Amino acid sequence: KEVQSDVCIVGAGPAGMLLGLLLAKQGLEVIVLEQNGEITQPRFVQLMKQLNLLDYIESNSHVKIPEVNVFHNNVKIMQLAFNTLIDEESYCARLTQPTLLSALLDKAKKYPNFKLLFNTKVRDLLREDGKVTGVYAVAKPGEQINFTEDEVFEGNLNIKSRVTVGVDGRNSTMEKLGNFELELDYYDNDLLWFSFEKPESWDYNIYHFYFQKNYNYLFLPKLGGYIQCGISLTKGEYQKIKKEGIESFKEKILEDMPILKQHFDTVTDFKSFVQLLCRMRYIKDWAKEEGCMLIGDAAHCVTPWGAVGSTLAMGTAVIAADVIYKGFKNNDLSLETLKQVQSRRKEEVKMIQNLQLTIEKFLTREPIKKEIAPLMFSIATKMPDITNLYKKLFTREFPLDIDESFIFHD
Amino acid sequence: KEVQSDVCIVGAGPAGMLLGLLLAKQGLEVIVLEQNGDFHREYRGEITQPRFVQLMKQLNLLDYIESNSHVKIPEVNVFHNNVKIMQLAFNTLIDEESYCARLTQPTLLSALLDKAKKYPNFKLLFNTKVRDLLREDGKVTGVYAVAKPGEQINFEGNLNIKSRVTVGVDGRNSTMEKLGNFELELDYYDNDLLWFSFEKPESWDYNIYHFYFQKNYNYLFLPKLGGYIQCGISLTKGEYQKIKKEGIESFKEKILEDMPILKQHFDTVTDFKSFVQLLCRMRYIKDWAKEEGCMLIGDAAHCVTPWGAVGSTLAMGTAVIAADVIYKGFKNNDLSLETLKQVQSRRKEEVKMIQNLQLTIEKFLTREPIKKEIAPLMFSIATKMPDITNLYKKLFTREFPLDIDESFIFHD
Amino acid sequence: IKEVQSDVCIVGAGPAGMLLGLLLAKQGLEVIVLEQNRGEITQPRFVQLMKQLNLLDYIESNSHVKIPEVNVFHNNVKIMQLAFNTLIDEESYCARLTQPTLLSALLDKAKKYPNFKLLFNTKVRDLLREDGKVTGVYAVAKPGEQINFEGNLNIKSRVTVGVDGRNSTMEKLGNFELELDYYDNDLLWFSFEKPESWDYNIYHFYFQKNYNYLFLPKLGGYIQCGISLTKGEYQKIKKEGIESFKEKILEDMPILKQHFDTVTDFKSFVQLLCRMRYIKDWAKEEGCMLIGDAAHCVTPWGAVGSTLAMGTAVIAADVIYKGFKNNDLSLETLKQVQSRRKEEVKMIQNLQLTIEKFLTREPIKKEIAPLMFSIATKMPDITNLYKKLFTREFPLDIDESFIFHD
Numbered sequence A: 001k002e003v004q005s006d007v008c009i010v011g012a013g014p015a016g017m018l019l020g021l022l023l024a025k026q027g028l029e030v031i032v033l034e035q036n037g038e039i040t041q042p043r044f045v046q047l048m049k050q051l052n053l054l055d056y057i058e059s060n061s062h063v064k065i066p067e068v069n070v071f072h073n074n075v076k077i078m079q080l081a082f083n084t085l086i087d088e089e090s091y092c093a094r095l096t097q098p099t100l101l102s103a104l105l106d107k108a109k110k111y112p113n114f115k116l117l118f119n120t121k122v123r124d125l126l127r128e129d130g131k132v133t134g135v136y137a138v139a140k141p142g143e144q145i146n147f148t149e150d151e152v153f154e155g156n157l158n159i160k161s162r163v164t165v166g167v168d169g170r171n172s173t174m175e176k177l178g179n180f181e182l183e184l185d186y187y188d189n190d191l192l193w194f195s196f197e198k199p200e201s202w203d204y205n206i207y208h209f210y211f212q213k214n215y216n217y218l219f220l221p222k223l224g225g226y227i228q229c230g231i232s233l234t235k236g237e238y239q240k241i242k243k244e245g246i247e248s249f250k251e252k253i254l255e256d257m258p259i260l261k262q263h264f265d266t267v268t269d270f271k272s273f274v275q276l277l278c279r280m281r282y283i284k285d286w287a288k289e290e291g292c293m294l295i296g297d298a299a300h301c302v303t304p305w306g307a308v309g310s311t312l313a314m315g316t317a318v319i320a321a322d323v324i325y326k327g328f329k330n331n332d333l334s335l336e337t338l339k340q341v342q343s344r345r346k347e348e349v350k351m352i353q354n355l356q357l358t359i360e361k362f363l364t365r366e367p368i369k370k371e372i373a374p375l376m377f378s379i380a381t382k383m384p385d386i387t388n389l390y391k392k393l394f395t396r397e398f399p400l401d402i403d404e405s406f407i408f409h410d
Numbered sequence B: 001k002e003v004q005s006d007v008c009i010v011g012a013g014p015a016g017m018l019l020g021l022l023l024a025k026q027g028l029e030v031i032v033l034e035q036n037g038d039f040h041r042e043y044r045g046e047i048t049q050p051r052f053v054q055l056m057k058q059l060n061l062l063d064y065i066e067s068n069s070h071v072k073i074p075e076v077n078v079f080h081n082n083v084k085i086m087q088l089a090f091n092t093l094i095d096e097e098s099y100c101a102r103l104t105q106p107t108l109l110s111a112l113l114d115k116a117k118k119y120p121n122f123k124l125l126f127n128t129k130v131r132d133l134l135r136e137d138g139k140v141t142g143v144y145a146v147a148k149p150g151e152q153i154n155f156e157g158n159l160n161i162k163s164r165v166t167v168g169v170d171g172r173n174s175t176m177e178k179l180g181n182f183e184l185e186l187d188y189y190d191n192d193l194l195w196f197s198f199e200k201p202e203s204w205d206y207n208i209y210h211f212y213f214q215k216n217y218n219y220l221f222l223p224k225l226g227g228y229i230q231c232g233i234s235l236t237k238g239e240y241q242k243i244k245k246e247g248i249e250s251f252k253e254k255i256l257e258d259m260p261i262l263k264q265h266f267d268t269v270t271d272f273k274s275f276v277q278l279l280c281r282m283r284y285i286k287d288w289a290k291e292e293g294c295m296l297i298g299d300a301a302h303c304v305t306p307w308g309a310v311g312s313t314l315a316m317g318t319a320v321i322a323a324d325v326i327y328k329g330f331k332n333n334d335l336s337l338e339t340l341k342q343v344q345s346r347r348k349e350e351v352k353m354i355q356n357l358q359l360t361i362e363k364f365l366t367r368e369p370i371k372k373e374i375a376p377l378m379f380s381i382a383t384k385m386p387d388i389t390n391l392y393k394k395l396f397t398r399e400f401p402l403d404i405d406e407s408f409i410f411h412d
Numbered sequence C: 001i002k003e004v005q006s007d008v009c010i011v012g013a014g015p016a017g018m019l020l021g022l023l024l025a026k027q028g029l030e031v032i033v034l035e036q037n038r039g040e041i042t043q044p045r046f047v048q049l050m051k052q053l054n055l056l057d058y059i060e061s062n063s064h065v066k067i068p069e070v071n072v073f074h075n076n077v078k079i080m081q082l083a084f085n086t087l088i089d090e091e092s093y094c095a096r097l098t099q100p101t102l103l104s105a106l107l108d109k110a111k112k113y114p115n116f117k118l119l120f121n122t123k124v125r126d127l128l129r130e131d132g133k134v135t136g137v138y139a140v141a142k143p144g145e146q147i148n149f150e151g152n153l154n155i156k157s158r159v160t161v162g163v164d165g166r167n168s169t170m171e172k173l174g175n176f177e178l179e180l181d182y183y184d185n186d187l188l189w190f191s192f193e194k195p196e197s198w199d200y201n202i203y204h205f206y207f208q209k210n211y212n213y214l215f216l217p218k219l220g221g222y223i224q225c226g227i228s229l230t231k232g233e234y235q236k237i238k239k240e241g242i243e244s245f246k247e248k249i250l251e252d253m254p255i256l257k258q259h260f261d262t263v264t265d266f267k268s269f270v271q272l273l274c275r276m277r278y279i280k281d282w283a284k285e286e287g288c289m290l291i292g293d294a295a296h297c298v299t300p301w302g303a304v305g306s307t308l309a310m311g312t313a314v315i316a317a318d319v320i321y322k323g324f325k326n327n328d329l330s331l332e333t334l335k336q337v338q339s340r341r342k343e344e345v346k347m348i349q350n351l352q353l354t355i356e357k358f359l360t361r362e363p364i365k366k367e368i369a370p371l372m373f374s375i376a377t378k379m380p381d382i383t384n385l386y387k388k389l390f391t392r393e394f395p396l397d398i399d400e401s402f403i404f405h406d
């Protein structure tokens, strides 16, 4: 087959869904290819009001989290209310990606200009003329999209689409295909997830972090009146942890957090946990060719602290959407103009990563630094200039300068 | 009235009394002059240090001293918002016997005097204010004392005590400093301690060395003789006057907010007349022996801030070295300035390394708006450092015994 | 006029540039040095590098003072001490080695080889190539000096290297990009007569109440002192007047009363800007490359400056010779220099950023910086960081021909 949809978007993640909808509202016939966190930041609310999409997003079900609290040995040592960072709307929210992804498509399917092909593993299809034409995708039945007529193409397809963007995600095959380079690749700690019944004593819209004797815990609201917890461990510590047996692991967890005694009286194995790798990649040059460019997690994946991940990629997509809409508005979509995305996001993307690196330094479990890290954190948050850090970690100082046409008027 | 004597010790404090006793066992006829009648005149505190236990063992006096009433304090505990952040047992500092004790000064002063009146070689004239009496030969012969009725150990009007070497142990508030034309190299005063005692609750123990970092104030808790607990509230110089202006009601409210177990005691507190304000003064004299036949030691020379219970035993330690200088000074008839200036040459190392250590500790008592919240966190971090035990040993114990003539040991 | 060709041009005769030419004269390529006309202390990385090139004895013959250890003070009380011999099993120490002595010593062993050439007092403009490459440079000369080889000249010499330094004009000519540009603090330098109380081979840093001080040995029995100030604070200091500034300095460091009993103005001080740069792509064209301070200038803490650029120049000299073993000295091969130094350069800089955070003078952070430094130096893993700051784990793998046989 041969599809000529002017632009192809590899990956149907939250960054891509925003790239297509902001380009389908422009007119460019885009084709999205998909092979198949829950907490948002005040940066997310700023972006949605910027495009006047907040009410549309806020219409769905979501739980607003008003503040972060950090404890040490079951005593509070830090408290920040997000409403106190910027004068505009500012808060964290429990908004699952399926909820946000479908709401973004519900307003995107109404525009036949876009097209998304679900359950389609995609290989590469470059161009011989010193550029990239598109990709080659081995499909699989099941999709609606906007170019099917109930027929589409349930097999091999060639989509020659001029400029090809890579938003596959953290586990991206597009990193290698484009012959890119990872300037920074970070991974030191894991998060061991598990849910439990929220006790009558606790609240629900919670962003709680605990520095306890044996492990450090992260608590978030889980959709359904439950609380999802994440224990922070060193890279490789989980394997050693399973060897010592569930009885010792439970005895240590209940020693730190005695309120989880009821929940772990039923836990008898390690099959209830979920290990997640807190990696953090960075690509040296996001646009190294003509018609080829990397954005999103494929370029600037980050650690989960601060809820920066989901909303940081989206912000880069919006700037790319302004370069792409302005790139066809001046007929300059070459390498020199496509690389302007990274030249505009370098400031915010790097400052966030370094700050994430500094935050990660508190998760150390080496024998002497471990005992003083909570005490250090309490001192750190008590500095005069801590509020600048909170503003830099959670909010944007100025809105993204884009074409006024990107605002959704009603 | 004229009286002669081998050595005159102005002031009968724990350093002055220990100096005389170590000299009556030597033979030198000493005369001690104290302006107060009985030993229990000034409070002067009641808590001793492991250094005190080691120095008494050097003189084979530990059993004689421990014979009296005393309460042994086995460990120090530091809390932050009523949560323990530090704990140290003095028995783990040195392999020998090591502990703090609640031993009142009148008890120790009378116990030392009971072994000194038995030697007719000594003499203490209680209730005798002492003015100055220099020597015409570019030196000091003794002192001139305006006496008063009191006790006697071996006159009732003007008296001149010309006794060659005259020691000044007058104390922190010493008149000897100005008479001898001395010089203060270091003069420190930053904080006050507001003392008050209360009935020990059933919840607490008694032999306690507890320091609390609370929201409003910091509290020190120690055993008070009689089963009570004496508390000291830490204030900055001049803050008390401001507190009294705000009234006992606001102050009691703030104390109870930090220490709710004191509601019982404060249901009876209705004014500030129940507290005792104490000035944490620390001083250091540049040259302790600047003339011939005259000397300062003890608190008159190097008084220190209370933390660690170093004060009594640090002054007594300098008195013990002074007793070694005078005993070997009469054994060679060399009691000149070059020989009397040897005391400071032997005490400078330990006295300066403790005074500077005190300065660091006092820095945790800061009450400025942001540093106040970080001083407990800083304290918790330091006490979790690998080499912290070296500091505890330096603060509470002596590494080696004071090298003195073997004749100073009290029999066996 | 005078379209001189030659084989290679190195713009800038800095410590990095000079060593690059001498490592090429032992190879054979006729090099041309261009100079238009700074840190007297080197680190143990320097001793490791000179042993690799068998040059240690050659420098140690010259005048130099070996500094064996750092001491960090807080209110005149020592809170850290580290001896460099305890870092690597080989020879390891700091030294006071003035740049004129090291720069001339490299030239005394380079002038003996007629293969090299350095044109002193020559401002250099650009001279690209019309065929999508770089031929050389255009230099407006002046009365200067001569090397073993007087008006406008164009030197088209295939590969042209930029070692101009921190104040580099060739950064702009090559259309380069600064990935990182840092500048937060200044150092106010002044020297004084070493008191009888002090030593000489000193690497002393003091956390005091008013200012933070650095003490280093000054060539000639004096001590050179550097006061740390925030960007723009010097201007504010001078308005307050020299009397106040001297009073505050003597408050921090009363031993300087004698030296400052004669100071009556600010003309005796020398302000230095602690800048730090990093170029995203060190070789972005064909035949054009930036190394040294022109590419990765760094802050003075640890004496990393001189020895770090030379390390990059040495790898660059090996890339050119091993690139000529296949005669592939194109952009794909010239990008090999940055691909081999990225790991070590980006680690020294990040450490320097963290070190620099201890120089903060903001109202609350200022009192706790000495306290934070003291804790960090007491960590179990501190010796590891000292190794990464002061020494290189393994010598640079280069052609065996680079060793100077006696």
Ligand SMILES: Cc1cc2nc3c(=O)[nH]c(=O)nc-3n(C[C@H](O)[C@H](O)[C@H](O)COP(=O)(O)OP(=O)(O)OC[C@H]3O[C@@H](n4cnc5c(N)ncnc54)[C@H](O)[C@@H]3O)c2cc1C
Pocket (backbone or CB within 6 Å): B010, B011, B012, B013, B014, B015, B016, B033, B034, B035, B036, B043, B044, B045, B046, B047, B048, B049, B128, B129, B130, B169, B170, B171, B172, B173, B174, B175, B176, B278, B297, B298, B299, B300, B306, B309, B310, B311, B312, B313, B315, B316
């Ligand atoms: C309120 C308070 C509490 C303390 N608590 C403690 C504690 O818990 N632990 C601890 O280790 N230390 C404590 N100290 C320190 C301790 O009191 C001294 O460190 C110790 O007593 C050494 O004193 P000294 O003999 O050098 O002088 P002092 O004990 O001050 O000398 C007092 C004697 O000097 C006499 N005298 C004074 N002036 C004259 C004069 N002009 N002529 C003649 N005689 C004179 C007095 O009459 C009296 O006999 C405390 C001090 C105070 C003020």
Ligand SMILES: CCCCCC/C=C\CCCCCCCC(=O)O[C@H](COC(=O)CCCCCCC/C=C/CCCCCCCC)COP(=O)(O)OC[C@H](O)CO
Pocket (backbone or CB within 6 Å): B076, B078, B211, B307, B308, B356, B357, B360, B361, B363, B364, B365, B366, B370, B371, B374, B375, B378, B379, B381, B382, B383, B385, B387, B391, B395, C079, C364, C365, C367, C368, C371, C374, C375
């Ligand atoms: C709190 C009042 C006392 C109450 C109980 C009294 C009895 C016993 C407690 C004694 C504990 C004393 C702990 C002191 C630890 C400390 O500072 O030592 C340090 C331990 O190691 C460190 O450097 C740890 C980091 C610094 C810790 C704090 C230093 C002192 C500062 C206090 C000010 C805190 C308030 C906040 C100010 C800043 C706010 C921005 C130095 O010891 P060293 O090995 O270098 O040798 C000793 C040195 O020579 C001493 O000068």
Ligand SMILES: CCCCCC/C=C\CCCCCCCC(=O)O[C@H](COC(=O)CCCCCCC/C=C\CCCCCCCC)COP(=O)(O)OC[C@H](O)CO
Pocket (backbone or CB within 6 Å): A361, A376, A377, A379, A380, A383, C070, C072, C205, C301, C302, C350, C351, C354, C355, C356, C357, C358, C359, C360, C365, C366, C368, C369, C372, C373, C376, C377, C385, C389
């Ligand atoms: C002061 C200038 C230096 C003068 C002498 C120069 C010579 C030698 C000194 C060399 C050693 C300097 C000490 C550096 C200690 C240090 O940072 O160690 C680090 C560990 O500590 C850190 O990461 C420190 C982070 C930055 C500290 C900034 C200084 C804070 C001080 C004052 C401002 C107060 C605001 C913050 C207070 C609360 C802190 C939590 C390296 O180990 P790591 O675990 O991070 O692993 C390595 C990783 O790759 C990161 O590097």
Ligand SMILES: CCCCCC/C=C\CCCCCCCC(=O)O[C@H](COC(=O)CCCCCCC/C=C\CCCCCCCC)COP(=O)(O)OC[C@H](O)CO
Pocket (backbone or CB within 6 Å): A068, A070, A209, A305, A306, A358, A359, A361, A362, A363, A364, A369, A372, A373, A376, A377, A380, A381, A383, A384, A385, A386, A388, A389, A393, C357, C372, C373, C375, C376, C379
């Ligand atoms: C802990 C998990 C997250 C819990 C809450 C989740 C969400 C959000 C909260 C994020 C808060 C992050 C606070 C980090 C503050 C921080 O380090 O900032 C830094 C402060 O400077 C530093 O780099 C301080 C040290 C960073 C931490 C180093 C490691 C400390 C922890 C454990 C090891 C202890 C031994 C080593 C100590 C080394 C000396 C510092 C920003 O730099 P700055 O000085 O220019 O900024 C000052 C700032 O304005 C006020 O501090």
